[PDB]
Design a protein around this ligand. Structure first.
Ligand code: CLA
Ligand code: CLA
Ligand code: CLA
Ligand code: CLA
Ligand SMILES: CCCCCCCCCCCC(=O)OC\C(C#C[C@@]12O[C@]1(C)C[C@@H](O)CC2(C)C)=C/C=C/C(C)=C/C=C/C=C(C)/C=C/C=C(\C)C=C=C1C(C)(C)C[C@H](OC(C)=O)C[C@@]1(C)O
Ligand SMILES: CCCCCC(=O)OC\C(C=C=C1C(C)(C)C[C@H](OC(C)=O)C[C@@]1(C)O)=C/C=C/C(C)=C/C=C/C=C(C)/C=C/C=C(\C)C(=O)C[C@@]12O[C@]1(C)C[C@@H](O)CC2(C)C
Ligand SMILES: CC(=O)O[C@H]1CC(C)(C)C(=C=C/C(C)=C/C=C/C(C)=C/C=C/C=C(C)/C=C/C=C(\C)C(=O)C[C@@]23O[C@]2(C)C[C@@H](O)CC3(C)C)[C@](C)(O)C1
Ligand SMILES: CC(=O)O[C@H]1CC(C)(C)C(=C=C/C(C)=C/C=C/C(C)=C/C=C/C=C(C)/C=C/C=C(\C)C(=O)C[C@@]23O[C@]2(C)C[C@@H](O)CC3(C)C)[C@](C)(O)C1
Ligand code: KC2
Ligand SMILES: CC1=C(C#C/C(C)=C/C=C/C(C)=C/C=C/C=C(C)/C=C/C=C(C)/C=C/[C@@]23O[C@]2(C)C[C@@H](O)CC3(C)C)C(C)(C)C[C@H](O)C1
Ligand SMILES: CC1=C(C#C/C(C)=C/C=C/C(C)=C/C=C/C=C(C)/C=C/C=C(C)/C=C/[C@@]23O[C@]2(C)C[C@@H](O)CC3(C)C)C(C)(C)C[C@H](O)C1
Lengths: 179, 228, 187, 171, 193, 222
């Protein structure tokens, strides 16, 4: 675990592990931990960015989400867990099915699976379709991966701050009492 | 041996009494740890209790008699003339939480391997000085002043003076423990501290519940109070 | 000498160990009275018919039906097809295949010493292969299908119920779906 | 050793799933004595059930208690309904035969089979003795096999009559 | 004898084989491997079942709905005892189907525990090597692979812990069921059981 | 211990009474085990009964005079003024079942071969020390104190003082097994102990009946 990335200057310069799950973890168990950390990181960053954009007066998409049923982007209120509740169940299934296909892909396509060697959190299909990070030095890439992990840890605390606000009003300061 | 050192420390604390371990807690193997680690823990607990009791005694005199900072802050919700048990009860819930949390951060820094190693010391249960709060030389962001001796008044003090000061710390901490709980006991079992009879008012409320009553939920921040 | 399937009887000499699906199982020594190649031809014909019968019965009972066909369960499917009229049509390819592949092959098996083994029509359009393990799989699947068809018919006729062919459905195959509260009572 | 003894016949031949005599062949004689004992008791029990089905003795079981032979059911209820003095006499007779008449074990606490005897040769001088070796072996094998089938059957009847009250299960 | 080498002897019985009836001395080594495999199987089933009963009695249920019409709390609102009935038929059918698959695979692995195999070490990747069947290589035991960080001595200590905890759980699960059936049988069990 | 050792122990406990086994329990082989182990079991029984009876004497005096713990709800629930035998019957059965199981865990700890041989002693039937109780050194989890001397006193006691103390333990146990039973017999049979007439409150129940509701027939749960 000492070799793995994540130890920035913000927790000494060392691994953060009160309970010591890394001590139990073997090399492949640490690979699982990093893969799960990264997936939670990425999903949380997407979730918190979407919640902020939707609920911070951002421009909702134009047109009707569902012409047949009449549901519109504007009709979906700019409120957490209300827009999702009012989204058509078919659209919810679309999102979940695309995510499930992508995750079975990221499990079956990577050849040296994060569990058996490999690199945790590498998904070649989705990353950089325009190749934006295809000519960066290896150091720079390591620094950017460290930035990814650090941003995502904050994002996954933030998305739970949003969630616990709706389910427990006035939980988070500096956040509306409703959602 | 750790027990030999503790025995000598007891003689220094009081040579007429000397080492008085009626329960054998030094000999007991707490957590299965050896006698050295157990004595380190027990000594650290003694100085921690004594330190906190001395601060608590001075704070009892400050709060009960009336000693408040001016301006916006937790002191503006405590009713005037409130008892020392009532001041903690009357400060805001977030004030209680942040006091206890700041104390928690200090305790965490106190037992952290990071700060103790940056200061070239070890944990008190693993061959270290029992009661040593480390300098904030590993707090990511630099902190201006350290907890112990913040202005560095003791940067050149003799080891003999420091040892005598620790002997004094233990004794005064024990005595302050007794006095502070004298105050607490006089308010719930009257006529138990004879001198304090009529001085300490009765307090109906659990001392050992920190958050009961939870206290007001006021918002004392004024400029930028977007969280209200 | 002692049979593998029956460890208290001597195996017959005709079974040996070359034939696919051979488990030394012949307590009545029927291979002596009946030729082994004829018996294998009969076994494979029955196995194939029972496999087709099981899959067709299960599909028709579950709901798959040809257009214009009567929408009935497999139990009444025979009577419904006979009543509607189109069921000698299926006999016609059966009659063709039998008359022009079984009778000549049967006569070749009985009389001609140089002939293909029982059930070997050389029918492999896809060339999947007639390996020993493949023939063993054929024999095992076929025998299981024979017993399965026997049970399926005898249970569908008895209960007149859906696909499980049991009185209480899947609960009979799976006792702990019934209550379990008497099991927990005795415990 | 043990693989060729009276009982190593039938479809299974020698049958030791949990390796009892394989681990302790010295205990095979004790096990044979116990098997013969249980088998014989079960033959008696199965015949008693089957014959109590249709034939019952005449007269009163206990005239003081006014309990008649025909009044009793056929099963465990009959043994329940026998008076306490009858049960005590039954135990006394069984104990007399067990300890004195037909001694299955010689002595100490962990009883060994008698020295100059077969595993279960408990009868005295006045008993049918077969002198043909083939017939003796065949009929001893018949004894132990019928005993085994009898104990399986008798457990079946006991469980059926416990569940329902009749040894005959419905069907 | 194979009995002297196996784990399971603990400090509680004086570090001696706890066999009052002597069946371990009586039966052969093959039956002893059967008995150890069955012991560990019952113990692991019971370590699952005891905590399951605790969760049910606490009425701690997942947030959601088992079927489309019944809630996890609706099933659990009658205590653990009357729960398997309230589970929909399809759900328990699928549970028992996967349990059947696991049992058949573990028994179908060639180095059988009786016939030359480690008792209780059911293969960690069932459904692998089966002709005409593909499943993910999700390791049955420890898919996160916590075992890689433990030496053989630590594995022996944890196997001893496994056997002892299994025995305690086999007692505890029947304790819970008996506490429900007979109300006063096991004290320290409240009315939820 | 041998019967010669028992004779020496008796002659040291009371020189005049001396060895006074008139029923020959010291000679009857218990469970077929040797006399040296029957002596161990009998001596452990004597010590254990004396221990429990001394504690019971003090506890009976404490319960009859209702010196109860101040900060518990079970004691408050039990009515005041009851006879000491009834102060046991008026308790939740779940507390009785935990007192008893505490003694069970302790007497499983005591007789354990591994703990005894780790600390150095053996079982009382295996030539060990009768009336010994091993500390909780080999316990699964840590615990603060042992049972015998949870504090330190008598960690530096001479073998002479220990021998004197064991003799006094046996003698005081023999006396307390009679004093406590004098209390019980005067409670449940008035005028049985002539000197306690009008001192011990009377009682109707069975002191050999721990739980109110019969556990063997119909218990109670919490
Ligand atoms: C579920 C998300 C998740 C996961 C899988 C991990 C995983 C990891 N983190 Mg952690 N981490 C997380 C969230 C997570 N982190 C968050 C939110 C923070 C910010 C507070 C951090 C801050 C952090 C730091 C500063 C460091 C790590 C490091 C690590 C690694 C070693 C420690 C370990 O074994 O953790 C295992 C974690 C789990 C098994 C999940 C915990 C489950 C409990 C029950 C949740 C309790 C939370 C509570 C509900 C609120 C490992 C790859 C170290 C590293 O990368 O070293 C190279 C390191 O330096 N993490
Ligand atoms: C009272 C019960 C009993 C006893 C003492 C025996 C004893 C014996 N049987 Mg067994 N046997 C029994 C019941 C019993 N049998 C029953 C009911 C059947 C019918 C299935 C058989 C069928 C049978 C066959 C076909 C053969 C034997 C043989 C033997 C001998 C082999 C050594 C052995 O493993 O025995 C020791 C057995 C025991 C101590 C019984 C243990 C039972 C446990 C406690 C419970 C088992 C669970 C449940 C009831 C089933 C031995 C004399 C073999 C023999 O004679 O080889 C030379 C042999 O070939 N037996
Ligand atoms: C049904 C579960 C089960 C099974 C199969 C086993 C199997 C085993 N145990 Mg046992 N054991 C169990 C439950 C079980 N145990 C429980 C609940 C406890 C806690 C009290 C123990 C405590 C225990 C200890 C402390 C030791 C063993 C040991 C053994 C081994 C030798 C004894 C033997 O032949 O047992 C065969 C078992 C059976 C035939 C099951 C008995 C079935 C009857 C009908 C149950 C009776 C009703 C109830 C009281 C064997 C692997 C010894 C060992 O590990 O040696 C290396 C050993 O020292 N066990
Ligand atoms: C109508 C239903 C049906 C059908 C069409 C088949 C078809 C088949 N079974 Mg059978 N089988 C059935 C019902 C059926 N089974 C039932 C109800 C059971 C009881 C559980 C079995 C149990 C069974 C076993 C145990 C085995 C077969 C096998 C086979 C295959 C033999 C040829 C082969 O290896 O091809 C080449 C192989 C393939 C194309 C891969 C398998 C394709 C699917 C998943 C099957 C074949 C695909 C054998 C086999 O090889 O299966 C893999 C085999 O071992 N079957
Ligand atoms: C998502 C993330 C996945 C995480 C994976 C982790 C994971 O699942 O790990 C699974 C796992 C693991 C692991 C490790 O790999 C780890 C993590 C790391 C590695 O170093 C070590 C190993 C081991 C490889 C273990 C699991 C063990 C279990 C389940 C044990 C369960 C055990 C239940 C019991 C004993 C129940 C007992 C009931 C009792 C005693 C009942 C009772 C009573 C009372 C009611 C109390 C009171 C009553 O009293 C009276 C009557 O008076 C008496 C009695 C007897 O009636
Ligand atoms: C004077 C004292 C005599 C005592 C001995 C005695 O009289 O021996 C007599 C004797 C042999 C002999 C000898 C003689 C030559 C005749 C007499 C000589 O004697 C002397 C003294 O010289 C020598 C001797 C003893 O060698 C033979 C005794 C034979 C006996 C008594 C044999 C029972 C088998 C039962 C079985 C297998 C049950 C299966 C039972 C089964 C499988 C079931 O329960 C099945 C079932 O029920 C279920 C569960 C439910 C139902 O719905 C359905 C059915 C019914 C299917
Ligand atoms: C939270 C909230 O609401 O808070 C409220 C309540 C609270 C906190 C009570 C408040 C307050 C009161 C506060 C904070 C008052 C602060 C007062 C203050 C700070 C008063 C300093 C006087 C210094 C003097 C006269 C120094 C002379 C010094 C001299 C003569 C020199 O300069 C000498 C010398 O240096 C030279 C020139 C340079 C060298 O050549 C030589 C030396 C070195 C010798 C506020 C503001 O209301 C806010
Ligand atoms: C009727 C008639 O005519 O007569 C009689 C009948 C009857 C009923 C018998 C009567 C009575 C009353 C009797 C005889 C009552 C007897 C009661 C009895 C005999 C009660 C012992 C308790 C001992 C305890 C708790 C000891 C703890 C001792 C402990 C825990 C120790 O610390 C031991 C110690 O060794 C260590 C470990 C360390 C050393 O440093 C030394 C010490 C000592 C500290 C009457 C009423 O009088 C009248
Ligand atoms: C409630 C119960 C109880 C009572 C009322 C009681 C009363 C008396 C009296 C009466 C006036 C005397 C004078 C006395 C003396 C000694 N007791 Mg004792 N005792 C009780 C309990 C235990 C336990 C649990 C242990 C123990 C022991 C010893 C030893 C150590 C000897 C040695 O270490 O050689 C000595 C000298 C320990 C042991 O080992 O005894 C062999 C031990 O484990 N006692 N004890
Ligand atoms: C000196 C000393 C010590 C000490 C000490 C003590 C008692 C220290 C106490 C420190 C304490 C109590 C420090 C509070 C800080 C509060 C902050 C930063 C709040 C920011 C708030 C912010 C940034 C809010 C911003 C906003 O609402 C704004 C304004 C409007 C918007 O535009 C944006 C938002 C909504 C976000 C040691 C080290 C312990 C020992 C040593 O020996 C001596
Ligand atoms: C059904 C049901 C229930 C149930 C049930 C249960 C658990 C039923 C269990 C029934 C069970 C367990 C029935 C075994 C029979 C075994 C037989 C007949 C074996 C004979 C075997 C014999 C006679 C062997 C003879 C031989 O040894 C001889 C003599 C010599 C050897 O040479 C040859 C062999 C080895 C062959 C509920 C739950 C109560 C309610 C529910 O609603 C309905």
């Amino acid at each position: 675990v000492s070799d793995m990335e994540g130890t920035g200057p913000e927790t000494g310069g060392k691994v953060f592990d009160p309970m010591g799950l890394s001590k139990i973890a073997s090399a492949e168990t640490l690979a699982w931990y990093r893969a799960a950390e990264l997936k939670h990181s990425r999903v949380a960053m997407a979730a918190v960015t979407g919640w902020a954009w939707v609920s911070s007066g951002g421009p909702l998409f134009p047109g009707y989400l569902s012409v047949e049923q009449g549901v519109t982007f504007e009709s979906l209120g700019r409120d957490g867990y209300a827009a999702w509740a009012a989204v058509p169940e078919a659209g919810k299934f679309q999102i979940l099915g695309v995510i499930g296909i992508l995750e079975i892909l990221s499990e079956s396509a990577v050849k040296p699976h994060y569990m058996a060697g490999g690199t945790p959190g590498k998904v070649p299909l989705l990353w950089d379709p325009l190749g934006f990070t295809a000519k960066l030095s290896p150091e720079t890439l390591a620094r950017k991966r460290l930035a990814e992990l650090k941003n995502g840890r904050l994002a996954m605390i933030g998305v739970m701050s949003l969630v616990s606000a709706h389910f427990i009003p006035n939980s988070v300061p500096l956040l509306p009492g409703s959602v | 041996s750790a027990k030999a050192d503790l025995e000598a420390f007891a003689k220094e604390c009081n040579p007429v009494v000397g080492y008085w371990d009626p329960l054998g807690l030094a000999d007991l193997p707490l957590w299965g740890q050896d006698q050295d680690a157990v004595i380190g823990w027990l000594r650290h607990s003694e100085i921690k209790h004594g330190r906190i009791a001395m601060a608590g005694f001075v704070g009892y005199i400050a709060h009960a008699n009336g000693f408040r900072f001016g301006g916006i802050g937790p002191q503006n919700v405590v009713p005037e003339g409130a008892s020392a048990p009532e001041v903690w009860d009357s400060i805001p819930f977030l004030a209680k939480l942040q006091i206890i949390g700041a104390i928690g951060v200090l305790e965490h820094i106190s037992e952290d391997k990071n700060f103790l190693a940056a200061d070239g010391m070890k944990h008190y249960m693993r061959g270290g000085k029992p009661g040593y709060f480390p300098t904030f030389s590993a707090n990511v962001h630099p902190m201006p002043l350290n907890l112990f001796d913040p202005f560095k008044w003791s940067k050149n003090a003799s080891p003999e003076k420091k040892a005598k000061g620790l002997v004094t710390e233990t004794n005064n901490g024990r005595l302050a423990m007794l006095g502070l709980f004298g105050f607490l006991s006089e308010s719930k079992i009257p006529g138990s501290v004879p001198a304090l009879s009529g001085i300490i008012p009765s307090y109906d409320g659990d001392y050992m519940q920190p958050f009961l009553p939870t206290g007001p939920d006021t918002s004392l921040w004024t400029i930028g109070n977007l969280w209200a | 000498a002692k049979s593998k399937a029956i460890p208290f009887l001597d195996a017959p000499p005709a079974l040996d160990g070359t034939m696919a699906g051979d488990k030394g199982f012949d307590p009545l020594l029927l291979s002596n009275v009946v030729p082994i190649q004829w018996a294998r031809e009969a076994e494979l014909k029955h196995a194939r018919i029972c496999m087709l019968a099981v899959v067709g019965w299960v599909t028709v009972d579950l709901g798959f039906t040809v257009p214009y066909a009567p929408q009935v369960s497999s139990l009444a499917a025979h009577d419904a097809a006979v009543d509607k009229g189109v069921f000698l049509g299926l006999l016609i390819p059966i009659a063709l295949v039998e008359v022009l592949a079984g009778i000549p092959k049967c006569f070749q098996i009985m009389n001609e010493p140089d002939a293909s083994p029982g059930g070997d029509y050389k029918f492999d359009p896809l060339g999947i292969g007639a390996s020993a393990e493949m023939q063993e799989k054929e024999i095992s699947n076929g025998r299981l299908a024979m017993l399965a068809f026997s049970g399926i018919v005898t249970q569908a006729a008895l209960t007149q119920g859906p696909f499980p062919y049991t009185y209480n459905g899947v609960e009979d195959l799976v006792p702990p779906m019934q209550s379990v509260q008497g099991a927990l009572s005795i415990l | 050793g043990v693989e060729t003894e009276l009982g190593a016949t039938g479809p299974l031949g020698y049958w030791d799933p949990f390796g009892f005599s394989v681990r302790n062949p010295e205990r095979f004689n004790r096990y044979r004595a116990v098997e013969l004992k249980h088998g014989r008791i079960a033959m008696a029990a199965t015949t008693g059930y089957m014959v109590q089905s249709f034939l019952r003795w005449p007269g009163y079981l206990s005239t003081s208690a006014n309990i008649k032979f025909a009044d009793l059911p056929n099963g465990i209820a009959a043994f329940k309904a026998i008076p306490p003095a009858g049960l005590f006499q039954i135990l006394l007779f069984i104990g007399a035969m067990e300890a004195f008449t037909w001694r299955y074990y010689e002595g100490p606490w962990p009883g060994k089979v008698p020295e100059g005897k077969a595993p279960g040769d408990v009868a005295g001088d006045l008993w049918v003795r077969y002198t043909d070796p083939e017939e003796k072996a065949f009929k001893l094998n018949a004894e132990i096999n019928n005993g085994r089938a009898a104990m399986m059957g008798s457990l079946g009847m006991l469980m059926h009559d416990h569940i329902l009250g009749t040894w005959v299960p419905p069907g | 004898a194979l009995v002297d080498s196996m784990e399971g002897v603990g400090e509680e019985t004086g570090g001696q084989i706890w066999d009052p009836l002597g069946i371990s001395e009586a039966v052969s080594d093959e039956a002893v491997m059967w008995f150890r495999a069955s012991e560990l199987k019952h113990g692991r089933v019971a370590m699952l079942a005891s905590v399951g009963y605790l969760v049910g009695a606490a009425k701690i249920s997942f947030p959601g709905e088992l079927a489309k019409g019944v809630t996890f709390a609706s099933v659990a609102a009658n205590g653990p005892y009357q729960a398997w009935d309230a589970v929909p038929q399809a759900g328990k059918l699928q549970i028992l189907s996967i349990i059947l698959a696991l049992e058949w695979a573990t028994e179908a692995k060639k180095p059988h525990y009786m016939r030359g195999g480690v008792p209780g070490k059911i293969e960690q990747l069932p459904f692998d090597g089966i002709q005409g069947l593909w499943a993910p290589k999700i390791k049955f035991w420890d898919p996160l692979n916590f075992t890689g960080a433990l030496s053989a001595e630590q594995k022996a200590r944890k196997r001893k812990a496994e056997l002892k905890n299994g025995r305690l759980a086999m007692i505890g699960i029947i304790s819970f069921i008996t506490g429900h059936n007979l109300p006063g049988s096991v004290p320290a069990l409240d009315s939820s059981f | 211990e041998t019967k010669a050792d028992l004779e020496a122990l008796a002659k040291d406990l009371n020189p005049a009474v001396g060895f006074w086994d008139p029923l020959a329990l010291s000679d009857y082989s218990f469970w077929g085990t040797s006399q040296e182990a029957t002596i161990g079991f009998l001596r452990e029984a004597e010590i254990k009964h004396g221990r429990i009876a001394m504690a019971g004497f003090v506890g009976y005096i404490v319960h009859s005079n209702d010196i109860r713990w101040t900060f518990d709800k079970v004691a408050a629930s039990v009515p005041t003024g009851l006879p000491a035998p009834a102060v046991w019957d008026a308790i939740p059965d779940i507390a009785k079942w935990q007192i008893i199981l505490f003694v069970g865990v302790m007497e499983s700890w005591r007789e354990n071969k591994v703990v005894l041989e780790a600390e150095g002693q053996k079982h009382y039937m295996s030539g060990g020390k009768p009336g010994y109780f091993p500390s909780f050194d080999l316990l699964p989890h840590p615990v603060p104190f042992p049972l015998f001397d949870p504090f330190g006193i008598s960690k530096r006691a001479t073998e002479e003082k220990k021998a004197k103390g064991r003799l006094a333990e046996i003698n005081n146990g023999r006396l307390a097994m009679i004093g406590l039973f004098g209390f019980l017999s005067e409670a449940t049979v008035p005028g049985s102990v002539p000197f306690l007439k009008g001192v011990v409150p009377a009682y109707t129940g069975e002191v050999m009946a721990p739980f109110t509701q019969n556990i063997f027939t119909a218990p109670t749960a919490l």
